[PDB]
């Protein structure tokens, strides 16, 4: 049970054990400090000789040295296993985030991913760290305090050892009540904070109707309600301490009375009584922290289960076995039908799109609907609903994704640039396999060395963020430069640029004239040149292959591309 | 200066001063407890069994009652003033953004206004109140303890009063070190969080190149770095205390030795040294918290200036003087040019629109460019850049907004509904002028009693956010109910219903029939009917009135309308 999770922390036994054994001391220091008080009072100012207490100052400075030193020692080596656990859990969580299907990045939680890796992991680490310090420092304080109370008294210690757990029960009962009261106040805050948002949501609708005069009053009401809720918060919050300490003080009064009611007691010297009172007026930090520590175990465990839920989500499917070497073939679609998880109306009806070997097919679309997602099935980002995307006679579901996505080179306007060497980005994820003599020729072949040698370090330049901010039109030039070195047989130019670089975009077009001498390419088109030389044009109108032919056999057939050729003429 | 900071809490002497008088008592009781601890040692346990042992058991509970009650009173009646200053400051702060020019809601800060007001106000007075009660009850403690310490010894506390500045300066310098060290970590966190966020943005572009492994490598080297920075945080922070603790301990040792070097001692009654020691160690909670109250004055003034940066920003221009009783005039544009504050490409080039009274104009440009914002100029949201939007023979800038924005009626589907009764929405900002007798038949004439009766009460259903959620098409019907009740002279449809709804459309096109019987109306038309029945159709091809004229004379003149009629044939 509890024993089962120790092997998870086994490599950190040194750090955690040093933490424990340098934590006990920080408590033992205070215990022995009060022990030092008894001679000072009983003999230092009880007896005449002044040398009786000259022993004190050295030993008190020494015990405070040994308390500060172990404070620092046990804070650090509990903030090093706090770190080498949050780190490994974050790293094991991000290594199971780069393997989730692209649908998981549907913008429902794009910003949260840094938080999931950080805020929740920081929460679990900090909660567990704080919980472990306060069930051991406080726990052995209490053991030490009661050991030194026994050695100096009998009856007072026995009376205290019974009536204190009543203070403990009081501490928890005053707390549980506070938590129960505070439970619904989050709902109250949500309800009150909704309304201010609504009113500043429609500021236009306030001006356009002359109604400032009847919005000042509404926010007057909402601000009054918010203030009264805050006052209720404060009033309910500040009956915790002034009540538990009242219970504790009544217990201390019982201690004093029932420790001096008969003549059986008062055998205590002037020192033992001060030591008993000292230990107890001290014991309030442990008896409360050790009692409220359970506010962290369940909270830390809640955070840990949150992390284990976000970890146990859906892995991107991998139900394929085949491995492809270099697939030159007539990739095809057949009766494909596909709807994004989370939507109702399908984007694609029965499709018979057919990329031939060598030839290239161009997609054109008036409303921009249904084109782009034909590039997210031919690479298996989204598994198709009903159909079979043939590729040399097999469904794409049966190829190992790492060997299928190894066939498709996706040039684009909006390609990503890792903040690394240009020599990396042109051979990204394969720098071991490819030498700089290949990049030397390739970055020329895509006409991009002219944009690189101008920089400070050439191909050593940091090219991403915190880097040299490569221009968007030249990120497409780099996308070509990269897809040349891979020299993959299926190409997916997105050509969604629309942006124009004079002569530079001309050099980009010349590069593409080198990129697609081969490499069956599904280019989604918005430019005259690509369609002009296109080998089989396939136009979709918002759901389905509407018209499909070749430019010279199309423009006479008035169809739908010709009446779109006019619109981008 | 501080003398003139008095009137801002003018009506709040009562609660604040009562808090102060019940807050000095909270320190005086702490002092009295140790004062009573003095006799309990020597006289109480020396040669007696009562008269101390009988006083103390009930007087201790008396003083802890007087301590708890004063803590409750202080906290509650300082929180009353805290909340009643938060409410008034936040009320003024909100009332100074209902008069803010609509540029302010350009999505730069639309969602952050609620967070701004609530967090800034909840921080400005929490810090000030904490500082106030941390400079009184942490400041009365020192005076009370020193009084009770001089009364019990004439010289043993002279060394403490001489020594205390050493402790104060040590605490302040250590805290200042820690704060100075904590400066660059904002930059470090920015540097690492930027890398982490940049790292998993391009998920598509990592899958497609088969580079998962060389990606987990980079993340493990980022997590290593960020954990190292975390350990630096903790190692820097955790040694703030254990050094000032050593300093105060050196103070205690110096005092303890000094109490025994010369013959000056032996005037210490057996319990006098006990209360002197206790009063000294109890003096660590004040003396340490008193130095670090400037750390809260600084935060309070920082937040005050932070809100003052906003409570006095730019204010929607009002520089007009004329008034309107009814805008029965022909709105005239002339050579108007306009580019959004914060944008470079001109949204509107030269214009010559001449909307005549009693007729309509249909803004129908396919580019969806420029028509949406010839409705934010005629109503004076975003003012023109060059030109004059003449209205009824006068300019807009010659007219006070109070009635200018009362003329136009901005019908649409996106009309935000206030969280009030439906028959409050219909006459919003005018509930006194319109009696529900009018509102009933007004819902009738705009076709609304039909979907209103089916509601639970009648024209009475709270309808806004967290209300009933009227249908998108019924929101248009209720927007007509408003605009028809007001009886405006200039109407601005917006036809945001590109996706038409049947049946609702019958009653919508029927309602809009009554609204546009007279009442000159700039209609952003998109539906065949409004364009067909318009009087001067006007297109805007992304910058300029391109093709203007009546329909049947415009279909014959191809230009850009016929080519745009075919697309929506």
């Amino acid at each position: 049970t509890f024993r089962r999770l120790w092997p998870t922390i086994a490599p950190f036994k040194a750090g955690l054990i040093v933490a424990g054994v340098a934590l006990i001391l920080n408590a033992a220091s205070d215990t022995f400090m009060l022990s030092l008080l008894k001679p000072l009072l009983d003999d230092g100012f009880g007896k005449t000789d002044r040398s009786v207490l000259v022993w004190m100052p050295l030993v008190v400075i020494g015990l405070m040295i040994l308390r500060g030193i172990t404070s620092y020692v046990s804070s650090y080596c509990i903030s090093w296993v706090s770190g080498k656990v949050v780190m490994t859990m974050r790293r094991r969580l991000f290594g199971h985030m780069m393997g989730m299907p692209v649908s998981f990045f549907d913008k429902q939680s794009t910003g949260t991913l840094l938080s999931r890796i950080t805020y929740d992991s920081e929460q679990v680490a900090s909660s567990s760290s704080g919980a472990l310090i306060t069930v051991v420092r406080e726990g052995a304080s209490i053991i030490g305090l009661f050991i030194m109370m026994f050695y100096y008294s009998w009856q007072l210690s026995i009376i205290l050892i019974v009536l204190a757990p009543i203070v403990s029960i009081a501490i928890r009962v005053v707390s549980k009540r506070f938590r129960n009261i505070s439970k619904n106040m989050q709902n109250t805050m949500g309800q009150v904070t909704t309304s201010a948002e609504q009113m500043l949501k429609g500021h236009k609708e306030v001006l356009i109707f002359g109604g400032q005069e009847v919005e000042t009053k509404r926010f007057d009401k909402v601000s009054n309600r918010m203030r009264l809720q805050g006052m209720k918060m404060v009033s309910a919050s500040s009956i915790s301490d002034p009540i538990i300490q009242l219970i504790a003080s009544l217990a201390l009064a019982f201690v004093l009375y029932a420790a001096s009611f008969p003549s059986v007691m008062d055998s205590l010297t002037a020192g033992t009584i001060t030591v008993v009172f000292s230990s107890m007026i001290a014991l309030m930090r442990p008896l409360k922290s050790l009692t409220n520590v359970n506010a962290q175990f369940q909270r830390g465990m809640a955070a840990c289960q949150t992390l284990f839920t976000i970890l146990d989500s859906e892995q991107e499917k991998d139900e394929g076995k085949r491995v492809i070497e270099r697939a030159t073939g007539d990739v095809e679609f057949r009766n494909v039908t596909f709807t994004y998880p989370g939507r109702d109306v399908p984007a694609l009806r029965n499709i018979n799109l057919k990329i031939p070997a060598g030839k290239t097919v161009a997609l054109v679309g008036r409303s921009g609907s249904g084109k782009s997602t034909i590039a997210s099935l031919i690479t298996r980002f989204y598994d198709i609903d009903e159909g079979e995307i043939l590729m040399d006679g097999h469904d794409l579901r049966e190829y190992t994704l790492a060997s299928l996505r190894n066939q498709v080179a996706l040039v684009s306007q909006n390609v990503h640039l890792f903040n690394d060497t240009v020599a990396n980005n042109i051979a990204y994820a394969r720098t071991e396999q490819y030498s700089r003599e290949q990049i030397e020729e390739a970055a020329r072949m895509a006409y991009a060395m002219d944009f690189i040698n101008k920089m400070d370090n050439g191909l050593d330049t940091v090219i991403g963020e915190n880097g040299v901010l490569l221009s968007g039109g030249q990120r497409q030039r780099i996308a070509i430069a990269r897809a040349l070195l891979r020299d993959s047989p299926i190409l997916i130019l997105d050509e969604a640029t629309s942006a124009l670089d004079t002569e530079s975009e001309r050099a980009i077009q010349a590069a593409l004239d080198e990129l697609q001498k081969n490499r069956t390419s599904l280019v989604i088109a918005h430019r005259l040149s690509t369609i002009e030389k296109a080998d089989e044009i396939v136009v979709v109108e918002d759901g389905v292959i509407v018209e499909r032919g070749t430019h010279n056999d199309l423009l006479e057939h008035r169809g739908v591309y010709a009446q779109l050729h006019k619109m981008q003429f | 200066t501080f003398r003139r900071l008095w009137p801002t809490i003018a009506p709040f002497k009562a609660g604040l001063i009562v808090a102060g008088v019940a807050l000095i008592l909270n320190a005086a009781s702490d002092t009295f407890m140790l004062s009573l601890l003095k006799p309990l040692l020597d006289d109480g346990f020396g040669k007696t069994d009562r008269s101390v042992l009988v006083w103390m058991p009930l007087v201790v509970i008396g003083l802890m009652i007087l301590r708890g009650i004063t803590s409750y009173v202080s906290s509650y009646c300082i929180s009353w003033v805290s909340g009643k200053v938060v409410m008034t400051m936040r009320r003024r702060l909100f009332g100074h953004m209902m008069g803010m020019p609509v540029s302010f809601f350009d999505k730069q800060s639309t969602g952050t206004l609620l967070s701004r007001i609530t967090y800034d106000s909840e921080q400005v007075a929490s810090s000030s109140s904490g500082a106030l009660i941390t400079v009184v009850r942490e400041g009365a403690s020192i005076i009370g303890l020193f009084i009770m310490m001089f009364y019990y010894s004439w010289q043993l506390s002279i060394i403490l009063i001489v020594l205390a500045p050493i402790v104060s300066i040590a605490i302040r310098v250590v805290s200042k070190r820690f704060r100075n060290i904590s400066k660059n970590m904002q930059n470090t966190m920015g540097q690492v969080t930027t890398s982490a966020e940049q790292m998993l943005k391009g998920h598509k572009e990592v899958l497609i190149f088969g580079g998962q492994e060389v990606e987990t490598k980079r993340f493990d080297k980022v997590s290593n770095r960020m954990r190292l920075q975390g350990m630096k945080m903790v190692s820097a922070s955790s040694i703030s205390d254990p050094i000032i603790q050593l300093i105060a301990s050196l103070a205690l040792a110096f005092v303890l030795y000094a109490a025994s070097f010369p013959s000056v001692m032996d005037s210490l009654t057996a319990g006098t040294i006990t209360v002197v020691f206790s009063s000294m160690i109890a003096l660590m909670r004040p003396l340490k918290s008193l130095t670090n109250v400037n750390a809260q004055f600084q935060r309070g003034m920082a937040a005050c200036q932070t809100l003052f940066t906003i409570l006095d920003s730019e204010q929607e221009k009002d520089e007009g003087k004329r008034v309107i009783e009814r805008a029965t005039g022909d709105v005239e544009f002339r050579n108007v040019t306009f580019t959004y504050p914060g944008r470079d490409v001109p949204a509107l080039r030269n214009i010559n629109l001449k909307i005549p009274a009693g007729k309509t104009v249909a803004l129908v440009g396919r580019s969806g460019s420029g028509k949406s914002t010839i409705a934010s100029l005629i109503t004076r949201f975003y003012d023109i850049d060059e030109g004059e939007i003449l209205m009824d023979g006068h300019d807009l800038r010659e007219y006070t907004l109070a009635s200018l924005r009362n003329q136009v009626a901005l019908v649409s589907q996106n009309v935000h509904l206030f969280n009030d009764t439906v028959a409050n929405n219909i006459a919003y900002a005018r509930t006194e002028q319109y009696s529900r007798e009018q509102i009933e038949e007004a819902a009738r004439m705009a076709y609304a009693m039909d979907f209103i009766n089916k509601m639970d009460n009648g024209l009475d259903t709270v309808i806004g956010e967290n209300g009933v959620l009227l249908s998108g098409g019924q929101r248009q019907r209720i927007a007509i109910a408003r605009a028809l009740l007001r009886d405006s002279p200039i109407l601005i449809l917006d036809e945001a219903t590109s996706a038409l709804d049947t049946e609702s459309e019958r009653a919508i096109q029927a309602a809009l029939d009554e609204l546009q019987k007279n009442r000159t109306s700039l209609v952003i038309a998109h539906r065949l009917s409004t364009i067909e029945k318009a009087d001067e159709i006007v297109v805007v091809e992304d910058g300029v009135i391109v093709e203007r004229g009546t329909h049947n004379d415009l279909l014959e003149h191809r230009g850009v309308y016929a080519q745009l009629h075919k697309m929506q044939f």
Partner: nanobody
Amino acid sequence: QMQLVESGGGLVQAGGSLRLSCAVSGSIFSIITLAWYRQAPGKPRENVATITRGSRTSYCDSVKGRFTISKDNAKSTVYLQMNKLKPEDTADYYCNAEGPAGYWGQGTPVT
């Protein structure tokens, strides 16, 4: 894999009118571009008429103002009506769906 079947006439007197029909079964009939092409015994194929998703009709030139085309919303069938026939119109007519590089019907020669 869809299929589209043509129904038409034979030999009629010149200057009259006729109606050809093509039923297209096996796909989404509403959106797909339907069309009618013709081919002479010697000359190759060529376009005659076209009809689109919003029924935006379009025609050749030598028969402009003389021909008509439409399609039933659910019947899934396209009608091409011919008026003022000429002797030069004796040719083999075909119907077509999804552009000029897709599916074709059997068609029929008309004199």
